[PDB]
Amino acid sequence: GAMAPSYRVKRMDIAKNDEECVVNAANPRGLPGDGVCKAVYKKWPESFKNSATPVGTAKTVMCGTYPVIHAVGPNFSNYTESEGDRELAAAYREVAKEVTRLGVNSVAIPLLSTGVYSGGKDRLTQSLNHLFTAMDSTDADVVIYCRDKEWEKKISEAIQMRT
Ligand SMILES: [Cl-]
Ligand SMILES: [Cl-]
Ligand SMILES: [Cl-]
């Protein structure tokens, strides 16, 4: 575990993370995809061997000794708000299980279902609160990666509010 487990946020490409493992915002089919998934495919393409996994689940595949946790959030274009909310919460609970199993002291995480799976809605708070619910009982240092300037401020504020 980390000596004083923390949450931090950085605005940059998650493929340049300084953590002991990465969470991929994956598709269920283990395809290269777009956005975070494509950056992860270019950096760790070996990790996409047998990475296909259902919505609401996470599947880890090693790239050398570096763990890539493929977490499949729901596409809110297809799911109801109610069923999408349940799958998005579940995906993050499966990430917490994998992070614990791997024994890492740190993890780089994106906000699941906030990009092309958002169904055109702002889900910063929804996705971040499910991340916190899952990760608060882990002792890994969590570093959240985003790409928007206003989102960096809102994530930072939400971390600081809990102290
Ligand atoms: Cl960058
Ligand atoms: Cl997304
Ligand atoms: Cl963002």
Ligand 3 center to residue 155 CA distance, Å?
A: 10
The number of the ligand nearest the C-alpha atom of 115 reads 2
Q: In this structure, which amino acid lies at residue 150?
A: E
Rounded-to-integer distance, Cα 147 and Cα 74, Å: 20
Q: Which ligand is nearest to the CA of 149?
A: 3
Contacts of range 145-151, beta carbons closer than 8 Å, 24 or more positions apart: 145/9, 145/10, 145/11, 145/12, 145/13, 145/14, 145/17, 145/36, 145/108, 145/109, 145/110, 146/9, 146/10, 146/11, 146/110, 146/111, 147/11, 147/12, 147/13, 148/11, 149/11, 151/11, 151/111, 151/124
Distance from the alpha carbon of residue 110 to the mean position of ligand 3, in angstroms: 8
Instruction: Report the alpha-carbon distance of residue 39 to residue 32 in Å, rounded.
Output: 9
Ligand 3 midpoint to CA 41 (Å): 19
β-strand partners of 63: 66
| Structural resolution in Å | 1.5
The two structure tokens encoding residue 48: 């996409």
Q: How far is CA 53 from CA 24, 29, 40, 65, in A?
A: 12, 7, 16, 21
Q: What angle do CA 157, 68, 43 make, to 5 degrees?
A: 90
> Token match 């799958």: residue?
87
Distance between Cα 42 and ligand 1 center (Å): 14
- Say which ligand is closest to the CA of 24: 2
